[PDB]
Design a protein around this ligand. Structure first.
Ligand SMILES: Nc1ncnc2c1ncn2[C@@H]1O[C@H](COP(=O)(O)OS(=O)(=O)O)[C@@H](OP(=O)(O)O)[C@H]1O
Ligand SMILES: Nc1ncnc2c1ncn2[C@@H]1O[C@H](COP(=O)(O)OS(=O)(=O)O)[C@@H](OP(=O)(O)O)[C@H]1O
Ligand SMILES: [Zn+2]
Ligand SMILES: [Zn+2]
Lengths: 180, 179
């Protein structure tokens, strides 16, 4: 039947909102986690100039398989194979120890699809801004700076995708003595 | 203002940040932002609504009423038409609760069609939530009383959207209420 991008976008936002409903950010105030995927998708439309509905849905859904009770077939059933494939690309293996997770992001970055690179860039940009705004509960200042150092290693492999996101990230890295 | 997707994410992000410290009354304390998102999703997924102004107003319909949001802030980000719709659906919170509910019944039939769509989906989400899980501290009579008052509001909203009104009619009938 006749669809619309507006309806498709709200499908993904509502899906993510229910999937993340019990989860919270790590700021002291414990912001509802759903604010993060919403803000990641909004970075893509408001700053990066992206309108691709598949990319925007994946941005709203990018942490669902990683962090919630969500399967790949569930994503494909609601949003199609292209969205599922994109969510698959940006989904970390939560069963690895933290260090191996982070190393894989660095290695996987250059061979990411353009859509996956956009999601990964906006994901990093949101979290780096969140760190700069407010040191998370349980994150030492050392851990924050280490996260920027690692994020620069990841963003290094994502470059050449979006001028606005990469210019923004380069400025935030430069403020912390990082080039990449 | 860009694409329709950009305008929806502007309103969803705006609403998410305004309701960031607010939770629903279910025992799990669901983030409040799930409610306006679900109300907007009712409009697109069940009611067939594609009017971007109505969908933004649904995402924003509780911001002025419940959060630190001014009318000028809404119009600054979303324009006069969205602001005017949000105005229409904004309850006076300074009234006692009985008076608040009285006013919704009074104001129902003379709302604009866009405001009637938002109010219908708002009611449908809340009644479905009540059927899903009784709010913390609510007795069964208070749940039934909410349905009885909601039916008085919906009676004034009728003639707006067949899909929304047929669904509300079913939920009312199951509880012995005829609209
Ligand atoms: N307040 C705040 N600021 C920044 N980041 C926050 C916050 N709360 C939670 N998060 C989420 O923490 C994720 C990064 O955590 P870690 O470095 O410990 O692990 S990992 O990088 O995901 O492997 C990162 O996960 P991803 O979104 O999957 O990248 C963030 O979403
Ligand atoms: N779990 C759950 N189920 C149903 N409704 C819920 C829930 N959590 C919060 N709410 C919001 O409560 C509003 C109706 O509450 P009340 O009957 O006490 O009336 S009042 O708001 O105090 O005037 C009603 O406000 P409105 O959205 O303005 O209609 C609901 O949004
Ligand atoms: Zn993320
Ligand atoms: Zn509401």
């Amino acid at each position: 039947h006749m669809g619309s991008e507006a309806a498709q976008l709200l499908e993904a936002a509502d899906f993510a909102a229910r999937k993340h409903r019990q989860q919270r950010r790590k700021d002291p105030e414990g912001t509802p986690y759903i604010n993060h995927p919403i803000g990641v998708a909004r970075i893509l439309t408001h700053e990066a100039g992206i309108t691709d509905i598949v990319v925007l849905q994946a941005a709203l859904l990018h942490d669902t398989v990683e962090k919630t009770d969500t399967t790949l077939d569930e994503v494909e059933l609601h949003f199609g194979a292209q969205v599922r494939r994109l969510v698959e690309e940006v989904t970390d293996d939560k069963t690895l120890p933290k260090l191996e997770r982070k190393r894989l992001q660095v290695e996987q970055a250059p061979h990411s699809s353009p859509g996956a690179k956009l999601v990964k860039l906006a994901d990093k940009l949101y979290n780096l801004r969140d760190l700069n705004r407010c040191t998370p509960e349980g994150w030492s200042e050392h851990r924050v700076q280490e996260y920027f150092e690692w994020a620069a290693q990841v963003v290094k492999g994502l470059q050449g995708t979006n001028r606005q996101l990469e210019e923004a990230l380069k400025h935030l890295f430069k403020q912390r003595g990082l080039t990449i």
